[PDB]
Ligand binder design. Structure first.
Ligand SMILES: [Cl-]
Ligand SMILES: [Cl-]
Ligand SMILES: [Cl-]
Ligand SMILES: [Cl-]
Ligand SMILES: [Fe+3]
Ligand SMILES: [Fe+3]
Ligand SMILES: [Fe+3]
Ligand SMILES: [Fe+3]
Ligand SMILES: [Fe+3]
Ligand SMILES: [Fe+3]
Ligand SMILES: [Fe+3]
Ligand SMILES: [Fe+3]
Ligand SMILES: [Mg+2]
Ligand SMILES: [Mg+2]
Ligand SMILES: [Mg+2]
Ligand SMILES: [Mg+2]
Lengths: 330, 330, 330, 330
């Protein structure tokens, strides 16, 4: 058996070392944008990365281009870092209009970086936008800032795609763009063709969604601009290696992409805090290749017949037969 | 101080005795629709009930009209019982087309009952519609049945309002109409003016929503047809007496209704399994009256100024000053 | 390859038809204890059942013995129905002392049934014991009733084992015996050798525990009297077919049982509400047989070496190699 | 009315600025230990702080003593920082024995600081101890390291109390000392009189416990060495200002402390990321003073009568009458 595997990608931050409110001295040394690209190269199966912007201090666009070329990598997305201290109280939704304007300027500049690097989208994740307490915000006004600010950004760059990465929460207690459905509602309201969704399987999962259903819902609106995969224990954005907890639902997610003829980079968004980051990516790709092989074995017509009958026993037996196929025989 | 309190209502089932998968012999004796109306009368401050339909065996529409009249109650909604054994595998989404048709006939008949009783809406809660396992359903086809079937029902009855009561889950592992945002998306797809939302505070809460924000979002689309209140511990539809766990967030919910000038019956949807059902309703009304008085005391301009600043400490101080006002000074 | 598979069992209720607060007319017709035993026979690989007591109306102990014999089944446990209407406000913890006494009498009688049927244990699940609201109970006095009442029961029957099935909640908002750790604390307080634990994988899972760790903790105290398995989405006791959502963690559970040489019936506690109940049990057994074969393939020494290093990437690689082995190569 | 209010305290980190994996440049400038003590002074009602150890770079014990004296503050606890990069893979449970030894040395030194400052306890919070993936650890061996390491520490310092702050998780996916009950089990196993519990109301709440019950359970074992309060939305350690979400359950927690004659510092453990930290503490103390006044008004005999009857309606009516007393009338 021979397979034409999907192209794989990762957020560049898969190869950064992290920091949290406890290990304030970091989970390893600070790595530059260039160090992170060199790390992604070591994985040996990636074709794309999503690069945060601005790059680390001192790193230029020319240096990034060179590192990417030497790594055999292309930029799939550019993620403006609209969640740093400057925007700790919001980017689109900062109470300070000057802060909102500065956020726009960074995101607008990031669309230029997308043009320069031939990336697919500006990946918009406004992590500091939302609320921490009941009564902290006017719900009407907060959501208006979110939607209007997004429209302003996208409207100023009609030639570039903006992929909104919804997330239930973190760092806020509740984020503005919190679910697939609310994101699609917001997209309707914005009214622009160049705004779509970055569907993070893990975000959907711990948000209580069926990630497979969310993929279908978004695809049905023509708004699935990209995906991210990882795993978690359904309570938080744990950002674990894909396939280590929820094999079945991850398989369902890829099944829905398959039947909808949705082609895209299979993209990792994972944070291997305490692990070898390169090896974490490698294990992830091994599992994803298994998923690809399992999709080939899956008896789709039999599954769909079971689904028409809504017989979960038949559906699960068919799915297990494909998924519980040998990973060690590739 | 003197107050013109809101009109209060309850689901008629607030006065039924329940049954679950363990206490299969029930939490008390079976009470007829008429017995339930007579119990609702005992509360002493209800003006409306939402009546399940069909009525209990042998009970006629004429008997119901007489009992409601004598009890000082009007029907605010009629809830077709589309979640009984016949539709245990779905109403709109049953795999058997004949079952789907039969559900339509009942719901269509319930629209007639709404006309006869002058009720505001058919209250649509398709509790058996959804899935229990990953891979059990075609998500595309399941949602299409849900939306198309709702359109068929509402389109056949343009003079009657249909309020969709979204709910995360139960009795299914996941219900079709599972959130405010998805419901609004579905309403846009249906494309009819007579379809709206029954927002149950408790469903929003355990669904991970800000109930206040959901109210605002729905009101912004002109689709808030009614409300249900209760409390829970945010993990399940516990259907506890309102104000016993989450006083702050229920106050926020009513605050949003107030600032939008949303006028409508303050409706209880509670299941006092092991309590005196009449006294549970009475305690709920006492709390709602406190909420109403607290809303009158609330410094709304100062709150809104704090919200513009997104200062949660100022917002909470103002809220606490109103909410912690004496309940024994009525 | 040839395997000596574990003996399989199920709660007899795996073959009952259910009822809930919505489908009050049931998910199917009422089946007698004898009908349930006859259905269990159909599965074709069960050796044991756990029987609720009292049996359904009119069914005698002699009839049960004959049906079990003819079905090829033995009683592994007897479950006194201490959660029916009589005890809807508690069994051990009922506020009415006469109700507490009546619960004792039933449980004491069930110990006799265990003697008569040669079962391993009285399976104690005090589902109605706990609380629904903050402030409803004296936590000190509630827990004292729970512990002292359990001591009274077990102390009166020193020759019989009592397996306490802990569970987070349902039908109460919180149950007394709510976790592995609390149960072990209670067992230490009771101070009797014949009180242990029925560890339900699904209860542990939606309770936020690592079921594997709970198994180890209980085994370390010599208190693992039996197991129940099923699956869920980690928010509720969904009681789905085992292996349909959390294959990795159920494999870990059985792995812990294996390395501790815990020998005991692999017991299903599942509620196939809307499915063919016999085929649900069959699919469950097929999966458990896969688990057994996967445990034989698992490189336990390499896993344990990875665990000493706390390297999750190595651990998961090893686990996946075993678990993803072919299910259709039996 | 005149009140002798409880002594108030806060973790010193209530006055630090924070950092997370997104705002890696921090939520404000780095404040030294001394700056934080000066901040605590500004609150104007604190008597105690819990100080992390080591102090910030360059800060000496002599300087801390001087700052504390000038602030009118005493050290209630010392928190060894066993969750920094060095111990990012565990303190007691690090796979590297050298790391475990270094953790012991820091904690042992911190017991000396407790002696010097006359603090009540070494506050032990081993945040990096636990696991991130299923199968990552030997559950038996991991828990053995946790218990044995704690015994080694406490046994080496029999004159000093060690308060274990249990927490469900964060930064790990699951922490070793994860619940009140498991902590009490561990304490039994350690077998030393100087090991007890720091009960964080928020940790109990998002762990699914009744914080009030947990307080009772721990007090019944004589192990409640201290408390921490804050609030959250039950899904995560949000560390919000106390009383902003769950007034009722916080009241219940203090009620249980009251009836058990448990006297201690009312201690805040909150992280006002985006707020004025001093004002956050001030609002907290205002709410806690309200709680104290409400406890004075509470009709405890009537409540306890309701609790004996397990009547939650009566219990809640009595509680509301006390809690919903005017906060603005002190
Ligand atoms: Cl698409
Ligand atoms: Cl409206
Ligand atoms: Cl054992
Ligand atoms: Cl104590
Ligand atoms: Fe992502
Ligand atoms: Fe993520
Ligand atoms: Fe409702
Ligand atoms: Fe409900
Ligand atoms: Fe069970
Ligand atoms: Fe169960
Ligand atoms: Fe704390
Ligand atoms: Fe905390
Ligand atoms: Mg094919
Ligand atoms: Mg049609
Ligand atoms: Mg006694
Ligand atoms: Mg007094």
């Amino acid at each position: 058996a021979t397979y034409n595997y999907p192209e794989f990608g990762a957020g560049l931050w898969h190869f950064a070392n992290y920091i949290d409110r406890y290990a304030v001295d970091g989970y390893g040394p600070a790595l530059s944008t260039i160090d992170q690209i060199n790390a992604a190269k070591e994985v040996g199966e990636l074709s794309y990365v999503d690069l945060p912007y601005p790059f680390t201090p001192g790193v230029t666009l020319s240096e990034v281009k060179d590192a990417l070329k030497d790594a055999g990598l292309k930029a799939i997305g550019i993620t403006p870092e609209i969640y740093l201290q400057k925007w700790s109280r919001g980017a689109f939704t900062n109470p300070d209009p000057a802060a909102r304007a500065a956020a726009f300027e960074l995101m607008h500049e990031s669309a230029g970086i997308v043009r320069e690097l031939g990336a697919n989208y500006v990946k918009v994740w406004p992590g500091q936008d939302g609320w921490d307490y009941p009564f902290q915000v006017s719900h009407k006004n907060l959501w208006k800032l979110a939607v209007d600010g997004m429209r302003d950004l996208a409207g100023a760059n009609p030639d570039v795609k903006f992929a909104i990465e919804y997330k239930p929460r973190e760092p806020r207690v509740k984020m503005t763009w919190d679910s697939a459905a609310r994101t699609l509602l917001g997209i309707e309201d914005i009214g622009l063709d160049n705004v779509g969704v970055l569907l993070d399987f893990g975000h959907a999962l711990y948000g209580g969604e069926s990630p497979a259903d969310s993929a279908q819902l978004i695809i049905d609106r023509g708004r699935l601009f990209g995906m991210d995969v990882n795993d978690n224990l359904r309570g938080w954005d744990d950002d674990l290696v894909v396939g280590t907890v929820h094999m079945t639902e991850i398989f369902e997610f890829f099944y829905v992409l398959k039947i909808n003829n949705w082609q895209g980079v299979w993209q990792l968004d994972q944070f291997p805090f305490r692990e070898n980051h390169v090896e974490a990516a490698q294990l992830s790709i091994r599992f994803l290749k298994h998923i690809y092989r399992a999709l080939d074995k899956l008896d789709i017509p039999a599954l769909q017949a079971a689904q028409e009958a809504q017989n979960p026993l038949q559906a699960q037996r068919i799915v297990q037969d494909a998924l519980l196929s040998s990973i060690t025989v590739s």
